[PDB]
Design an enzyme around this catalytic site. Structure first.
Site, PDB file in Angstrom:
ATOM      1  CB  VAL A  16       3.290   0.672   4.246  1.00  0.00           C
ATOM      2  CG1 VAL A  16       2.154   0.252   5.181  1.00  0.00           C
ATOM      3  CG2 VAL A  16       4.172   1.714   4.926  1.00  0.00           C
ATOM      4  CB  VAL A  41      -1.045   0.017   1.132  1.00  0.00           C
ATOM      5  CG1 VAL A  41      -2.047  -1.111   0.932  1.00  0.00           C
ATOM      6  CG2 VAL A  41      -0.378  -0.078   2.496  1.00  0.00           C
ATOM      7  CB  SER A  80       7.082   4.531  -0.141  1.00  0.00           C
ATOM      8  OG  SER A  80       7.403   3.771  -1.282  1.00  0.00           O
ATOM      9  CE  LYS A 129       8.180   3.536   7.664  1.00  0.00           C
ATOM     10  NZ  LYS A 129       8.255   4.778   8.493  1.00  0.00           N
ATOM     11  CB  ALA A 168       9.159   8.122   7.025  1.00  0.00           C
ATOM     12  CE1 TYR A 169      14.028   9.101   6.543  1.00  0.00           C
ATOM     13  CE2 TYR A 169      13.127   8.581   8.702  1.00  0.00           C
ATOM     14  CZ  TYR A 169      13.644   9.493   7.813  1.00  0.00           C
ATOM     15  OH  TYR A 169      13.778  10.806   8.200  1.00  0.00           O
ATOM     16  N   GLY A 170      10.956   3.412   4.529  1.00  0.00           N
ATOM     17  CA  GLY A 170      10.477   2.044   4.444  1.00  0.00           C
ATOM     18  C   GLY A 170       9.277   1.968   3.528  1.00  0.00           C
ATOM     19  CG  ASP A 192       5.907   9.484   7.613  1.00  0.00           C
ATOM     20  OD1 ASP A 192       5.802   9.348   6.378  1.00  0.00           O
ATOM     21  OD2 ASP A 192       6.047   8.518   8.397  1.00  0.00           O
TER      22      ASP A 192
END
Ligand SMILES: Nc1nccc(-c2c(-c3ccc(F)cc3)ncn2C2CCNCC2)n1
Ligand SMILES: [Ca+2]
Ligand SMILES: [Ca+2]
Ligand SMILES: [Ca+2]
Ligand SMILES: [Ca+2]
Ligand SMILES: [Ca+2]
Ligand SMILES: [Cl-]
Ligand SMILES: [Cl-]
Length: 344
Positions: free
Chosen positions: A33, A25, A27, A48, A29-31, A163
């Protein structure tokens, strides 16, 4: 728990059997999902997977920062944690971190796009943002990049901020003091963003759709008027100050003529949010008391956060120290009760 592997977004995810039907579903923050079904409770969740969480001290500290932050956030309008897991059985093989929260199917752009929102609906959406901001601001956590794509919304328009406290990003919602790198700013950077979001929900048009930082500043000044000399205090760069000072002077517009047909209470609130002077900008807690939200406001249900210890932010530690600290936070996590609320 038994884990299983599944390739998602071109990489292997390794998750407990408890979480099923993983599907991407987007991207974070830093990963990235995935939505999933939690077979323990029958609830839908979002998982995530952090991207390379311990590749460098930058990744390692931001992994710790995010896990610490999300373990602290316990508010209905703020992303928090249902679970955190790793397939690692020890610190020595610890290299992957997965964060779990309630599934929120959309972002605010999915609400404001194909619908003429009613004023009552806009009130509810902005009210929820402000309730979440009151909570995070009370723990001295600022978002700094609040925007519709950072507001998660479910099928019933319940909203959560994500975020916070942490590729070409849109700058259309950023506070002028952030966009232009002013020397000092406070929590009300986020209130500017709320004003831009709210304006767009009411009119269906982006308030300040600038093509670059200069065009965006010009659009802003056309609405709010050229600032006084006091504001130049905030700007280090002499060329930037000289430029702003050089602009032909513009009066503030009457917002009643900009937002024709809007609820006059909405116009009044926007006037209090979209002020260049961040020391005169309304706070989240003050905005919740504004008559625009009269039908939703409830002082018994607008809580503040427990104190949050951010002393780690000033520290430089080795990658393995951040990693071990993160591992400790994974192991010590206590899942919340499924039902944490009672009738008023
Ligand atoms: N669908 C959904 N539901 C809830 C959250 C997210 C989520 C997370 C996230 C954060 C913490 C966590 F523990 C689990 C997930 N990070 C980014 N996003 C989405 C935000 C909206 N655009 C798609 C990605 N996505
Ligand atoms: Ca920080
Ligand atoms: Ca209530
Ligand atoms: Ca209950
Ligand atoms: Ca509920
Ligand atoms: Ca009550
Ligand atoms: Cl956005
Ligand atoms: Cl500057």
């Amino acid at each position: 728990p038994t884990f299983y592997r599944q390739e998602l977004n071109k990489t292997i995810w390794e998750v407990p059997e408890r979480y099923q039907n993983l599907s991407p579903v987007g991207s974070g923050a830093y990963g990235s999902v995935c939505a999933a079904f939690d077979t323990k409770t029958g609830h839908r969740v979002a998982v995530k997977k952090l991207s390379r969480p311990f590749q460098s001290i930058i990744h390692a500290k931001r992994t710790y920062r995010e896990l610490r932050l999300l373990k602290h956030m316990k508010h209905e309008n703020v992303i928090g944690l249902l679970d955190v897991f790793t397939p690692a059985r020890s610190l020595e093989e610890f290299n992957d971190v997965y964060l779990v929260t309630h599934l929120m199917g959309a972002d605010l752009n999915n609400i404001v796009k194909c619908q003429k929102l009613t004023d009552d609906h806009v009130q509810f959406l902005i009210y929820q943002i402000l309730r979440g901001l009151k909570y995070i601001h009370s723990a001295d956590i600022i978002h700094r990049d609040l925007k519709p794509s950072n507001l998660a919304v479910n099928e019933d328009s319940e909203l959560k901020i994500l975020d916070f406290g942490l590729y070409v990003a849109t700058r259309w919602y950023r506070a002028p003091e952030i966009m232009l790198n002013w020397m000092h700013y406070n929590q009300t950077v986020d209130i500017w963003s709320v004003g831009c979001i709210m304006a767009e929900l009411l009119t269906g048009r982006t308030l300040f759709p600038g093509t670059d930082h200069i065009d965006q500043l010009k659009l802003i000044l056309r609405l709010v008027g050229t600032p006084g000399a006091e504001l130049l205090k905030k700007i280090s760069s002499e060329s930037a100050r000289n430029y702003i000072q050089s602009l032909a002077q513009m009066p503030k517009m009457n917002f009643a003529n900009v937002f024709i047909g809007a609820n006059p209470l909405a116009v009044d609130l926007l006037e209090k949010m979209l002020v260049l002077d961040s020391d005169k900008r309304i706070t989240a807690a003050q905005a919740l008391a504004h008559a625009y939200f009269a039908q939703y406001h409830d002082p018994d249900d607008e809580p503040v956060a427990d104190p949050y210890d951010q002393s780690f932010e000033s520290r430089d530690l080795l990658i393995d120290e951040w990693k071990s600290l993160t591992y400790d936070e994974v192991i010590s996590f206590v899942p919340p009760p499924l039902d944490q609320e009672e009738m008023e």
